[PDB]
């Protein structure tokens, strides 16, 4: 079988130049758990609809919920 | 012209044919073995060469 191999000068260079998928494949780093792409995009499209932080809107709707 | 007819006769012969069930035969090989057996049945075993090598004779 035939492949491709890379040795570095140090694990510092290895961890600054190797991709994260190969690092977590070797078990050197931890694969960060993320929400799916659809959920991320839905969150971004929901946050596009608010102008600013939205805390004032949140307290106003929590006031207006009773009426 | 005759646009009419006897539409009750459709499928007459197909219904009248006695159902003859297929006999079960030894399995005939498929592929390179079949080309091999055709080659043998035509050339080295030339069994029926009657005058000019007929292929599907009548029983006579």
């Amino acid at each position: 079988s035939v492949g491709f191999g890379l040795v570095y000068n140090s694990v510092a260079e290895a961890k600054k130049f190797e991709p994260t998928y190969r690092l977590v494949r070797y078990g050197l780093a931890e694969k960060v758990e993320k929400a799916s792409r659809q959920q991320r995009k839905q969150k971004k499209n929901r946050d596009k609809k608010i102008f600013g932080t939205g805390k004032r809107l949140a307290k106003k709707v929590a006031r207006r919920n009773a009426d | 012209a005759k646009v009419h007819g006897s539409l009750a006769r459709a499928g007459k012969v197909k219904s009248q044919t006695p159902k003859v069930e297929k006999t079960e035969k030894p399995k005939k090989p498929k592929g390179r073995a079949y080309k091999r057996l055709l080659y043998t049945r035509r050339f080295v075993n030339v069994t029926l060469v009657n005058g000019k090598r007929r292929m599907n004779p009548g029983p006579s």
Binding site: - | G31, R32, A33, K35, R36, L38, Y39, T40, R42, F43
Partner: protein, 184 residues
């Protein structure tokens, strides 16, 4: 919007479907060389038609032409390399005078049969398909291989196969299990 993969057809059906001369000639060829369709003969005749067309449109040009010299030498070299064309016949007209049995004589099936590890071209076919062969040190399971006139010194059984050792085999191991049961 990616570059399309190029593909080609490798054969051509004849014009007249049913003529007894072509039919029984190619059936003799298929029986003598152990083929499963007429498609192999059609493919070989297609390659031969292309080679003959190249030889024709090279011969229309006169000699001392760089294109004729270059591509005629290349084609002659490729044919004498695969061994379909003998070393004396290197004059670009024997290339036209070739026939399909010269090409079919270089397939791995008939080459195994000539080397005598099969005793029949059908035995060679099933051996090649069942991976009990190695043209160099690599297993090949294609009968239409067109050995390159240097590989016959290396056509032999595969090392990781029965008739090459290192394991008996499936039904042999089974029979060893059944006879060990009878031993018990």
């Amino acid at each position: 919007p990616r570059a399309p993969r190029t593909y080609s057809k490798t054969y051509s059906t004849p014009k007249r479907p049913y003529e007894s001369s072509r039919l029984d000639a190619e059936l003799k060829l298929a029986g003598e060389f152990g083929l499963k369709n007429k498609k192999e003969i059609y493919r070989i005749s297609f390659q031969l038609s292309k080679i003959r067309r190249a030889a024709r449109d090279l011969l229309t040009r006169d000699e001392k032409d760089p294109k004729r010299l270059f591509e005629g030498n290349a084609l002659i070299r490729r044919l004498v390399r695969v061994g379909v064309l003998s070393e004396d016949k290197k004059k670009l007209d024997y290339v036209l005078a070739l026939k399909v049995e010269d090409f079919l004589e270089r397939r791995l099936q008939t080459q195994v049969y000539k080397l005598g590890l099969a005793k029949s071209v059908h035995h060679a076919r099933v051996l090649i398909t069942q991976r009990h062969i190695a043209v160099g040190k690599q297993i090949v399971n294609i009968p239409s291989f067109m050995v390159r006139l240097d590989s016959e010194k290396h056509i032999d059984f595969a090392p990781t196969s029965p008739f090459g050792g290192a394991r008996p085999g499936r039904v042999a191991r089974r029979n060893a299990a059944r006879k060990a049961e009878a031993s018990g």
